[PDB]
Amino acid sequence: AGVKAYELRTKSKEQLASQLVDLKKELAELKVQKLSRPSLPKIKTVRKSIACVLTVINEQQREAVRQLYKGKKYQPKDLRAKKTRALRRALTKFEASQVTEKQRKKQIAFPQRKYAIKA
Amino acid sequence: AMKKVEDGNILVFQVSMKANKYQIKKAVKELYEVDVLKVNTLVRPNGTKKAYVRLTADYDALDIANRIGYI
Amino acid sequence: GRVIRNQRKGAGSIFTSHTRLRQGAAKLRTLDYAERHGYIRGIVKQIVHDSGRGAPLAKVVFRDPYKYRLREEIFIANEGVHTGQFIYAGKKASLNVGNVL
Amino acid sequence: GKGTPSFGKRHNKSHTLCNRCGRRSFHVQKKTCSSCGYPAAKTRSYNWGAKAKRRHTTGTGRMRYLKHVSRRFKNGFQTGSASK
Amino acid sequence: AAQKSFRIKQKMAKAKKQNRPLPQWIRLRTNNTIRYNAKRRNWRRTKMNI
RNA sequence: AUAUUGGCGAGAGACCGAUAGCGAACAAGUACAGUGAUGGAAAGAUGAAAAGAACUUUGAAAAGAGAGUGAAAAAGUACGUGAAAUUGUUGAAAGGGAAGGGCAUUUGAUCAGA
RNA sequence: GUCGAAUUUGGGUAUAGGGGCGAAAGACUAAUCGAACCAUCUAGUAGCUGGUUCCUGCCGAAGUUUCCCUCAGGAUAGCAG
RNA sequence: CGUGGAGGUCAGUGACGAAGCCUAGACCGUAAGGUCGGGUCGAACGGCCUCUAGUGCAGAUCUUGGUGGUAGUAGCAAAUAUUCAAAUGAGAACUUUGAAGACUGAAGUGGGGAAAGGUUCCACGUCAACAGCAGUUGGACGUGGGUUAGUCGAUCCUAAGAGAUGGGGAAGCUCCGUUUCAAAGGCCUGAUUUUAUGCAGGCCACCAUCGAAAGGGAAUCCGGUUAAGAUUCCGGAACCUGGAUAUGGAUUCUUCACGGUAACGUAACUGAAUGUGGAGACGUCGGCGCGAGCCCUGGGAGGAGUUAUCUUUUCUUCUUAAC
RNA sequence: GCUUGUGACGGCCCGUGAAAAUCCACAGGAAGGAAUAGUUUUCAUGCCAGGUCGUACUGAUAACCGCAGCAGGUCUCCAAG
RNA sequence: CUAUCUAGCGAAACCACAGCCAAGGGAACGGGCUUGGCAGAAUCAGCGGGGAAAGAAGACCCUGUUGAGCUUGACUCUAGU
RNA sequence: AAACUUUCAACAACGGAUCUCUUGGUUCUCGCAUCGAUGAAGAACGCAGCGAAAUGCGAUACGUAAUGUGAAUUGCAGAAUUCCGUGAAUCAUCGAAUCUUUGAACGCACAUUGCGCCCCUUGGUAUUCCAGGGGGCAUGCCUGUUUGAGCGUCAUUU
Numbered sequence A: 001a002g003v004k005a006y007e008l009r010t011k012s013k014e015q016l017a018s019q020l021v022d023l024k025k026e027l028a029e030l031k032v033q034k035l036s037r038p039s040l041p042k043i044k045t046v047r048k049s050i051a052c053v054l055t056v057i058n059e060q061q062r063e064a065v066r067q068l069y070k071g072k073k074y075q076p077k078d079l080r081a082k083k084t085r086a087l088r089r090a091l092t093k094f095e096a097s098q099v100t101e102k103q104r105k106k107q108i109a110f111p112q113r114k115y116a117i118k119a
Numbered sequence B: 001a002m003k004k005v006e007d008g009n010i011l012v013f014q015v016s017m018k019a020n021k022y023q024i025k026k027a028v029k030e031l032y033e034v035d036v037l038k039v040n041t042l043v044r045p046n047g048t049k050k051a052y053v054r055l056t057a058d059y060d061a062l063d064i065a066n067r068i069g070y071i
Numbered sequence C: 001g002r003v004i005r006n007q008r009k010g011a012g013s014i015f016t017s018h019t020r021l022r023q024g025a026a027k028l029r030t031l032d033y034a035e036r037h038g039y040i041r042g043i044v045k046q047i048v049h050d051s052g053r054g055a056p057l058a059k060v061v062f063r064d065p066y067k068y069r070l071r072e073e074i075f076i077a078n079e080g081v082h083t084g085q086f087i088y089a090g091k092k093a094s095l096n097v098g099n100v101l
Numbered sequence D: 001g002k003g004t005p006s007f008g009k010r011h012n013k014s015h016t017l018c019n020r021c022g023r024r025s026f027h028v029q030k031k032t033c034s035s036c037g038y039p040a041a042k043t044r045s046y047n048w049g050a051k052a053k054r055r056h057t058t059g060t061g062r063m064r065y066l067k068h069v070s071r072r073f074k075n076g077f078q079t080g081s082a083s084k
Numbered sequence E: 001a002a003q004k005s006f007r008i009k010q011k012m013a014k015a016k017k018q019n020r021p022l023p024q025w026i027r028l029r030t031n032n033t034i035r036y037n038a039k040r041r042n043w044r045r046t047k048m049n050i
Numbered sequence F: 001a002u003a004u005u006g007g008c009g010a011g012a013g014a015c016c017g018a019u020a021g022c023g024a025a026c027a028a029g030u031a032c033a034g035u036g037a038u039g040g041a042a043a044g045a046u047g048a049a050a051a052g053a054a055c056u057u058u059g060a061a062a063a064g065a066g067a068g069u070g071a072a073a074a075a076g077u078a079c080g081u082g083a084a085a086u087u088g089u090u091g092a093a094a095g096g097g098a099a100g101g102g103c104a105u106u107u108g109a110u111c112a113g114a
Numbered sequence G: 001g002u003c004g005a006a007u008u009u010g011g012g013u014a015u016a017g018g019g020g021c022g023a024a025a026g027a028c029u030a031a032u033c034g035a036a037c038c039a040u041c042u043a044g045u046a047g048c049u050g051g052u053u054c055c056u057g058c059c060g061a062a063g064u065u066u067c068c069c070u071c072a073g074g075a076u077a078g079c080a081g
Numbered sequence H: 001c002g003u004g005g006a007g008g009u010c011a012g013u014g015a016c017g018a019a020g021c022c023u024a025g026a027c028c029g030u031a032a033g034g035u036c037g038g039g040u041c042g043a044a045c046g047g048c049c050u051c052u053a054g055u056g057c058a059g060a061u062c063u064u065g066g067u068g069g070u071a072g073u074a075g076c077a078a079a080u081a082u083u084c085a086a087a088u089g090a091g092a093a094c095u096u097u098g099a100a101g102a103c104u105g106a107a108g109u110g111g112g113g114a115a116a117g118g119u120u121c122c123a124c125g126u127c128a129a130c131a132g133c134a135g136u137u138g139g140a141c142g143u144g145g146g147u148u149a150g151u152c153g154a155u156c157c158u159a160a161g162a163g164a165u166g167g168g169g170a171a172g173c174u175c176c177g178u179u180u181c182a183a184a185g186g187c188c189u190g191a192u193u194u195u196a197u198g199c200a201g202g203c204c205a206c207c208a209u210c211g212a213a214a215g216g217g218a219a220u221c222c223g224g225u226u227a228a229g230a231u232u233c234c235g236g237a238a239c240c241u242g243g244a245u246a247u248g249g250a251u252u253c254u255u256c257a258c259g260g261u262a263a264c265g266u267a268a269c270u271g272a273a274u275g276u277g278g279a280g281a282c283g284u285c286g287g288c289g290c291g292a293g294c295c296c297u298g299g300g301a302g303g304a305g306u307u308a309u310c311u312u313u314u315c316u317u318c319u320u321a322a323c
Numbered sequence I: 001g002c003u004u005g006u007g008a009c010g011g012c013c014c015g016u017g018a019a020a021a022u023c024c025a026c027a028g029g030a031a032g033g034a035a036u037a038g039u040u041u042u043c044a045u046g047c048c049a050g051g052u053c054g055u056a057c058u059g060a061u062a063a064c065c066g067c068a069g070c071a072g073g074u075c076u077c078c079a080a081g
Numbered sequence J: 001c002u003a004u005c006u007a008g009c010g011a012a013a014c015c016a017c018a019g020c021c022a023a024g025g026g027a028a029c030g031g032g033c034u035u036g037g038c039a040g041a042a043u044c045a046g047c048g049g050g051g052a053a054a055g056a057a058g059a060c061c062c063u064g065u066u067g068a069g070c071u072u073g074a075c076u077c078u079a080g081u
Numbered sequence K: 001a002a003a004c005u006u007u008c009a010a011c012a013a014c015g016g017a018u019c020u021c022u023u024g025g026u027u028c029u030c031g032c033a034u035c036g037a038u039g040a041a042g043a044a045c046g047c048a049g050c051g052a053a054a055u056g057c058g059a060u061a062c063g064u065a066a067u068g069u070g071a072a073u074u075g076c077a078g079a080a081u082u083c084c085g086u087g088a089a090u091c092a093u094c095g096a097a098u099c100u101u102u103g104a105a106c107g108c109a110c111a112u113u114g115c116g117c118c119c120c121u122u123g124g125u126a127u128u129c130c131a132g133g134g135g136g137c138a139u140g141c142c143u144g145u146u147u148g149a150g151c152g153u154c155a156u157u158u
């Protein structure tokens, strides 16, 4: 019933490339057959198998690049997180929590006290 | 198209609308292991691309078509 | 209540000059060192008709004093100037018809 | 003339297809779309043309990315995977 | 014009491909309000205006 | 704390009920018109279920007449109900340059009350 | 009428609305011209024209006074409920 | 009095039939209206007390939709014109074939194209609608097929003009301006080959780009072929551009050729920067010369027509591309 | 003779009737250059490649515009007796 | 060639209701009302007396405290200079 | 007397009113804050066994991956029923991807599917020509880097 991504994920990139080529050959043969045969739906399964193999190949390649860029700043922009444009432009948590020395001193000296009226 | 295959030694392919004659020639050569004498192309009125690929005299287009599955 | 014809002329849409066939702006040589101090000799190559201008123009070729090349100038031909005539332009040029002094 | 005999001379297109909006409102000689304003950076629209704004506004296409923005916000713009 | 731009030819190709009646197996689907191709165009009736 | 005829998610109404309510309940900003800016409709309802009429017969055929399905065909996709204008047939009546109307009674038809 | 030059005409291009263009007719500017078309302001205002949807019962007018840039309108008094 | 909706109530009516609709059938009310029966029909609805309003139509050249009389009426009369037979078919004035009669009469009713259209082209099937009669036919309907390029165009060039940049104006949308008040440059290579590049010898610039399928412009013709494509396919025969290249030739011992008095000739016969010149490249009209194609015509070699008579006759084939 | 191409001329203008891409030539003389050999892809022959888009048909008393299968309008080439 | 008759096809204008007159009176020129004359189905081709026939909220004229085009030492301003 | 005309009824027409329906509109209230050069909104063209549209999607094309659910989808065809299963589905969810040609739209253009330049690589002897594949080349501005310009200017050798 087509390929399974969890099965493809156990294979090396060379095996995946070979399987992709075989699936493309099979799709070509199937669309040759389609001209004569009336209404064969097996083409859809091979198309989805090609899509699955391509997805797994891209997952492996992108994971490899993620490992290559792990930790260092300036990762590729398509590997960076896609929040909104405004969210990416917003101050980090470090910024916007920065306080001046005077402000830090006075907020340590006089924090909002906890109190209750008891009568 | 089948008459062209039989009599003119010309295979008729639907090809990518982005493919040029060089790409068609090299793809036919790689896919079917044949030498290509000439590639003529047109854009059909339905918006797909049709390539008349005349193989060299060394190869028989009817035999190639039989191999690749349409007689 | 309407913009009159002489007012409409200033926008220059259909009232621009028909300059296609013209030979180029008829001008003296640029005033340079040679003309300011001595003279320079050019040659009248052609006396041609300018479209839209009654006077004929004279194409006069001078040598470039600073680069090896010829510079063609479009003078307005004075009467009696002929092709193959030497024109002298500058402070030291002679008082002959066609000279620029 | 000026009626039926004059309508016979109509074979030169004042407008052709606009690359930006595809409306056949691209004035050939002005090189400007009468509908969307191409090649101006801004898209032409007017507050007196409320119906035209409604015709061309957001939501009249397929919103290839804006349609999922809201679900992504609802999930908080998470970045990992569902992790079985 | 017989010397047409590719853009024009692409539009004509799309128009040709969509110049067809309603598929007959539609009108058999479960609810199927669709009765006929209401967007059918013909060269003798309504011009594409490019 | 304030605004919010846009966006997203909700809950409602002494609101409208397909000529109403948004232009759009439907493949509606669609079809279509205009060179263009723009303009811009119409269009919901078989039945519980297609059970969407096998089969026979007449016809070149569309169809008809049967048969059949169905609670119903006085529901047959020209489909719920099915008004009026306007029309066919049937029946009744009257009719010398309109017709219609009022009061009264004759005649014909029809009918309640007791 | 004119028909070999102030000729006819295709295509390209320019001139855009109090603007253009006009061998001048207020002509032409997409069947629109003594100010195009489109949308909006805008349900513009109208002392003017038209219309204004059930029944019955009771009462029942005025076209006159004064003022008005008033004379096809209104205010005012009168008549009426 | 009547209508849509609302609170209350009649534990109101109803698939054993609500609502709606039709009904020269009945009853009540002066009336607005109300009630009943019969038919039709199929899912809701009503009485009373109150609440509420987008609440009552004959009109508005009202709005939308629908429908009449007019009325089987006006009419379907420009573009010379049709006819016979067969076939097909349910059906033929109109389709197809044959025959005949006509017309366009080469400034075409012929053969191609530009704009425009967009599949109308072609085949098969096919007639409900459309072709203001008809229809078996169709530019219709249904399904398919079809457009093949180094040489034809676009693409490139610039034209009138359009239009960024540098700048300036404008609150601004944007406007001006097109070489301007700008530090606006790639291409040669000494040398480098720590790398033919940076340092570094040295040559050229008063400027984006768009703008022509009739202007300019590298190069292809003939024959054949399809249902429908052809300067595109096939066969043959060429040519141009870009590139790579090795022979032969030529040239050199007087290194970069000889001959001719000359005009100039040639199979070649070094040539950077830079400069100069030419071609591209140009109106219109008139007569004259020449060419091509066509027209006319002689002989001959064929085929056809007329032949009571006449006619060594009437018609027709006899062609030769680019290179 | 008709159509057309072309040549040499002639008439006309207060009209003298595009531009650029591109190609060639010349001037110049930088430089590179021969003798068990050097020089020349402007001579001949030989090798390779030439992409992309358009290409059907009508072009009008029915394929365009005019609400339409409208006696209207719509540029041009060929052209027998 | 129509008109005409037939087969097929098949609109529109217009329409309060309609369609015989004379006189009378009447919004002072009636198809209707009054008084008379009269008056018999259903119709076809023509016709231009009448329907104060159709077409269009008279374009002339007046009114409106409705405009607009245009002009001028009108009133009030204004670009420019 | 028929025909004809007119009126009424029945049945049949025409037409689509009425009634009853209502996945729609309208208005009110409540909560929330999230478009885009990481390429948006919008456009064009495509993609299904059989679709013209709507809807979905992008050559991985009515979709791929992931997660959940737990047996469908359905007009036909086809497939499967092991379906006690990493597993149906036009399911839901959705965090990984793809995402043609465009578009603020970015090599230059664009009435052209027109024309360049750079890097890596492959083929055609091939650094130079041609072609295929992959990756690039907009503008304004900021910080920084590097290379520079100006007798603007300091010192120093002189």
Ligand SMILES: [K+]
Residues within 6 Å of the ligand: G034, J068, J069
């Ligand atoms: K006026």
Ligand SMILES: [Mg+2]
Residues within 6 Å of the ligand: B041, B042, H149
């Ligand atoms: Mg081609």
Ligand SMILES: [Mg+2]
Residues within 6 Å of the ligand: C016, C017, C019
């Ligand atoms: Mg000028």
Ligand SMILES: [Mg+2]
Residues within 6 Å of the ligand: D002
């Ligand atoms: Mg006009």
Ligand SMILES: [Mg+2]
Residues within 6 Å of the ligand: D014, D029
């Ligand atoms: Mg124009």
Ligand SMILES: [Mg+2]
Residues within 6 Å of the ligand: none
């Ligand atoms: Mg509605």
Ligand SMILES: [Mg+2]
Residues within 6 Å of the ligand: none
């Ligand atoms: Mg209704």
Ligand SMILES: [Mg+2]
Residues within 6 Å of the ligand: none
């Ligand atoms: Mg218009």
Ligand SMILES: [Mg+2]
Residues within 6 Å of the ligand: F045
């Ligand atoms: Mg209905």
Ligand SMILES: [Mg+2]
Residues within 6 Å of the ligand: F072
């Ligand atoms: Mg029933």
Ligand SMILES: [Mg+2]
Residues within 6 Å of the ligand: F082
């Ligand atoms: Mg019914």
Ligand SMILES: [Mg+2]
Residues within 6 Å of the ligand: none
């Ligand atoms: Mg009736």
Ligand SMILES: [Mg+2]
Residues within 6 Å of the ligand: none
């Ligand atoms: Mg006058």
Ligand SMILES: [Mg+2]
Residues within 6 Å of the ligand: G043
């Ligand atoms: Mg009002």
Ligand SMILES: [Mg+2]
Residues within 6 Å of the ligand: none
């Ligand atoms: Mg009284």
Ligand SMILES: [Mg+2]
Residues within 6 Å of the ligand: G072
């Ligand atoms: Mg009055």
